[PDB]
Design a protein around this ligand. Structure first.
Ligand code: HEM
Ligand SMILES: CN[C@H](C(=O)N[C@H](CO)Cc1c[nH]c2ccccc12)C(C)C
Length: 392
């Protein structure tokens, strides 16, 4: 089997092999950096199957040496479960993580975006849209929603990479940092259990205590992945989307002249940005399934290359082009099926507010350096810039 990943990810460049695989051999056997060999899955149609079909299981990974890019299997909480356990956590979260709760955050999210831009302007150009905007924006928002104090970022931020590192941390460092984050969240739950605030951890603890619906460990691990998704995934998608807009100035011009395009722009950025560096978490077949002429037998794993599905020309016309006017856009950037992203309404709100605020307050915003001088963060399961210097 081919060794996978075929090539380490570069900037937002997509490996040309995916297009070749989608054309000529959409499912290919590979050997993974860690765990069992796997079937790499590349097409949109097969991606929906392995993410949503009940014959593909996440919970069965725990009974294998899970095919993976990370030295140890990730503690993915709800994203590691099947029904019924999955249903139990999903339902608790749906009941507390409501559309109303998110939409009610809108004034505070808009205010935080304005405050960060006030600071950028006060500090003078060039500013860093990563550490000076995307990171503290995403961080304050998820911290406010979850009830993790943003003032604790200095302690907890250095543990998050353990949930994402592929090539750049040892087993022992990952275990230690995973334990630190879980232990940190566990102590916060003792406080929020005694002294509830208007945040997700408080309401999760209350709903769970009152129905004996979740173990402490399950609560800790679930709150932990919510922190990572809000802090790391949002800021990564946001900074990558800014790079795409800067490098497609014609589309950026169109967005500023027709702001009603912003909802569709956010969806096109979800599809076009190859945010996931390679694949999301593996699933295992419960029965034989044929995908694209390749037989995946029971007990074998599949790797969902979501970014490749989002570049599937059989689904998106000119899929290799960023077009923020695109109307047909069944992208899988928020997943699909049972494990589809519960945070997508919030992520969409954050993306819209952040891009609208920057374009309205900083109309002349532009990248301060050639795209070739940028430093990207390597060795993680998602792509992000370390710095995005800008002028206005
Ligand atoms: C731009 C931002 C985000 C992107 C691109 C994103 C992407 C995704 C994707 C692709 C999945 C499915 C993974 C798979 O099936 O292997 C997922 C699941 C999930 N996401 Fe998001 N996410 C984002 C933000 C968030 C936020 C802000 C939260 C919560 C605060 C969140 C919470 C979750 C949860 C809990 C799941 C698992 C749901 C389940 O297993 O039923 N995400 N996300
Ligand atoms: C490769 N998997 C991607 C990722 O960034 N995963 C990260 C790093 O492994 C962990 C994570 C982010 N959002 C989560 C939600 C629930 C459990 C785990 C995570 C996708 C999840 C985007």
């Amino acid at each position: 089997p081919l060794s996978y990943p075929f090539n380490e990810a570069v900037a937002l460049d997509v490996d040309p092999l995916y297009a070749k695989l989608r054309a000529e051999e959409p499912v290919v056997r590979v050997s993974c950096p860690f765990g069992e060999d796997a079937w790499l899955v590349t097409s949109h149609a097969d991606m929906k199957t392995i993410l949503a079909d009940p014959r593909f299981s996440r919970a069965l990974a725990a009974e294998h040496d899970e095919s993976r890019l990370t030295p140890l299997p990730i503690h993915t909480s709800i994203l590691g479960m099947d029904s019924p356990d999955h249903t139990r956590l999903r339902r608790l979260l749906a009941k507390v993580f409501t559309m109303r709760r998110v939409e009610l955050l809108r004034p505070r999210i808009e205010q935080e975006a304005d405050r960060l831009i006030d600071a950028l302007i006060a500090e003078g150009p060039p500013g860093d849209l990563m550490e000076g905007f995307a990171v503290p924006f995403a961080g304050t928002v998820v911290c406010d929603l979850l009830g993790v104090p943003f003032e604790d970022r200095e302690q907890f931020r250095g543990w998050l990479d353990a949930f994402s590192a592929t090539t750049v941390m040892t087993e022992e460092e990952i275990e230690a940092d995973t334990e630190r984050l879980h232990g940190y969240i566990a102590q916060l739950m003792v406080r929020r259990r005694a002294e509830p605030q208007d945040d997700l951890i408080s309401a999760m603890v209350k709903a769970s205590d009152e129905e004996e619906k979740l173990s402490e460990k399950e609560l800790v691990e679930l709150a932990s992945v919510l922190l990572i998704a809000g802090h790391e995934t949002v800021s990564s998608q946001l900074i990558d989307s800014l790079h795409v807009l800067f490098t497609h100035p014609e589309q950026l011009r169109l967005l500023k002249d027709r702001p009603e395009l912003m909802p569709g722009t956010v969806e096109e950025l979800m599809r076009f940005v190859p945010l996931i560096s390679h694949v999301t978490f593996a699933r295992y077949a419960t029965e034989d399934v044929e995908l694209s002429g390749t037989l995946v037998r029971a007990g074998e794993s599949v790797l969902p290359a979501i970014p490749s599905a989002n570049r599937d020309e059989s689904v998106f016309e000119n899929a290799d082009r960023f077009d923020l006017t695109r109307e047909h856009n069944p992208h899988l950037g928020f997943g699909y099926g049972i494990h589809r992203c519960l945070g997508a309404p919030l992520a969409r709100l954050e993306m819209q507010v952040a891009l609208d605020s920057l374009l309205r307050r900083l109309p002349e915003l532009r990248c301060a350096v050639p795209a070739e001088s940028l430093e990207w963060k390597d060795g993680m399961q998602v792509r992000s810039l370390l710095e995005l210097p800008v002028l206005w």
